[PDB]
Amino acid sequence: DPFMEALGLKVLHLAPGEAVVAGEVRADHLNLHGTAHGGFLYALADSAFALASNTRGPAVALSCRMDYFRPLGAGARVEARAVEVNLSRRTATYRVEVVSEGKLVALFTGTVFRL
Amino acid sequence: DPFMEALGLKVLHLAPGEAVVAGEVRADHLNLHGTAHGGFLYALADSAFALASNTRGPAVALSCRMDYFRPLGAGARVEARAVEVNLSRRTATYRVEVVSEGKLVALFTGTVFRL
Amino acid sequence: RDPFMEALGLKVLHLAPGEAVVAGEVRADHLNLHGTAHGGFLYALADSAFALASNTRGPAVALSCRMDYFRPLGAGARVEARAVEVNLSRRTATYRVEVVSEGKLVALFTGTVFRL
Amino acid sequence: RDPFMEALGLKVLHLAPGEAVVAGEVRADHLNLHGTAHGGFLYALADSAFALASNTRGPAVALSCRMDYFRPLGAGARVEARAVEVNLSRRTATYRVEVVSEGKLVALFTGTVFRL
Ligand SMILES: [Cl-]
Numbered sequence: 001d002p003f004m005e006a007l008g009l010k011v012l013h014l015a016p017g018e019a020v021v022a023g024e025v026r027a028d029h030l031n032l033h034g035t036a037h038g039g040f041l042y043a044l045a046d047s048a049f050a051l052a053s054n055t056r057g058p059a060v061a062l063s064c065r066m067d068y069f070r071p072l073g074a075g076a077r078v079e080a081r082a083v084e085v086n087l088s089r090r091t092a093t094y095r096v097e098v099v100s101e102g103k104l105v106a107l108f109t110g111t112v113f114r115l
Numbered sequence: 116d117p118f119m120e121a122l123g124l125k126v127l128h129l130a131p132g133e134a135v136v137a138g139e140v141r142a143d144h145l146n147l148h149g150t151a152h153g154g155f156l157y158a159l160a161d162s163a164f165a166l167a168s169n170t171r172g173p174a175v176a177l178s179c180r181m182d183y184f185r186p187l188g189a190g191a192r193v194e195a196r197a198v199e200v201n202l203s204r205r206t207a208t209y210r211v212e213v214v215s216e217g218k219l220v221a222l223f224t225g226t227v228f229r230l
Numbered sequence: 231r232d233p234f235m236e237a238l239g240l241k242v243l244h245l246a247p248g249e250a251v252v253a254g255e256v257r258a259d260h261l262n263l264h265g266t267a268h269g270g271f272l273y274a275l276a277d278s279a280f281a282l283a284s285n286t287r288g289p290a291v292a293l294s295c296r297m298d299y300f301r302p303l304g305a306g307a308r309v310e311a312r313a314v315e316v317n318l319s320r321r322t323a324t325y326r327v328e329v330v331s332e333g334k335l336v337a338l339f340t341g342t343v344f345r346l
Numbered sequence: 347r348d349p350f351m352e353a354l355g356l357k358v359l360h361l362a363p364g365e366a367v368v369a370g371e372v373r374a375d376h377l378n379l380h381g382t383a384h385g386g387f388l389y390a391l392a393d394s395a396f397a398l399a400s401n402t403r404g405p406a407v408a409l410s411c412r413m414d415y416f417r418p419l420g421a422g423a424r425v426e427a428r429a430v431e432v433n434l435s436r437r438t439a440t441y442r443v444e445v446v447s448e449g450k451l452v453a454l455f456t457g458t459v460f461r462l
């Protein structure tokens with residue numbers, strides 16, 4: 001996955017209906033304020049979401065929600081754990097927990113359309 | 116903004132409560148499927164959202180929603196237009212329309228906490 | 231008419247392709263412990279307009295909806311939910327619904343349906 | 347008790363710090379045109395558990411909520427909304443609420459409040 005590679009993300013776990021993607025907040029991932037850009041954290045969660053959902057077959061994202069809990073500084077190590085919440089014939093929903101230093105720093109919820 | 120720069124995003128419009136950010140889907144923005152990664156489109160919308168909201172003062176994102184309408188191929192030119200929906204003393208909400216070839220390809224809705 | 235809509239006293243004020251306006255009043259049985267309009271009532275109002283607007287394109291079922299609350303509403307307030315189409319695809323569609331009262335935007339609803 | 351909750355026949359089954367369980371039955375006045383539980387009723391149920399769970403930490407007001415629908419529910423179905431705390435910060439808090447009936451997950455609600 002080109003975008004994952006460009007952001008330095010690595011797949012740490014993969015299994016039917018689940019996936020864990022990890023990354024570090026690099027200098028090129030910061031916002032003008034000096035903390036991890038919301039787009040980087042979302043990209044991380046979205047990547048785990050994409051991998052987990054696709055273990056069930058071709059699927060395209062329809063709607064996703066991202067809830068931010070704590071700002072992250074440069075160098076922060078982050079892991080996104082995707083878990084299957086619902087699996088229907090035409091759609092599926094996943095929860096992705098973004099964790100750093102053993103605490104939940106963001107929560108992602110997404111639904112895909114199964115091709 | 117480091118992340119914006121790293122993704123090749125440019126600010127095309129900026130004004131009180133609004134902003135337009137543009138970008139092109141590069142080779143490093145594609146997913147394993149060959150289309151624009153959901154994280155890239157979100158990063159674009161989130162950047163416009165961040166710029167528009169901060170014209171009102173320091174603000175941090177709390178919750179954001181991204182609705183995807185059409186897959187984008189490599190080279191697609193995309194623009195994210197942020198508009199202020201609500202401005203309260205402690206929070207504010209923005210709508211960000213992601214457009215390509217004159218059509219809405221994604222819709223972003225986000226709320227910030229005003230510092 | 232829709233049973234739940236009727237029970238809540240909601241009326242369809244306008245309905246056209248891709249759009250709908252539903253109106254209601256915050257009644258005593260729509261209040262929360264605080265004495266203001268319950269979040270569920272405002273959502274029910276928005277959801278009703280959403281359902282009507284989306285159905286103009288053919289049968290559909292709601293998949294995901296977001297409700298953003300901006301202002302509290304008091305008992306007796308007359309409120310409207312104005313739904314407009316944001317996107318119409320072959321298998322899904324998305325709508326924006328503004329909840330307004332006395333010219334003020336009370337809440338914003340965003341929803342996507344799966345087209346049957 | 348909460349007026350809107352009462353009007354919908356909802357009962358508080360469990361309440362502890364950061365969590366709550368609200369129960370109800372899909373009544374005739376909770377149905378949509380299709381004859382299934384109206385999306386607004388299921389949201390009202392989830393929102394009620396959300397409000398109760400969040401209030402255990404002190405006064406708060408809902409800011410943004412998401413409702414994801416998975417299965418339709420028929421008239422007469424007994425349903426529960428189970429709220430759990432996902433995050434508690436100084437100014438905001440977030441909860442996950444599962445709507446379940448007959449052991450099946452009917453919907454998923456995610457909500458964030460602003461702490462007063
Ligand atoms: Cl959402």
Ligand SMILES: [Mg+2]
Pocket residue numbers: 237259353375
């Ligand atoms: Mg009644």
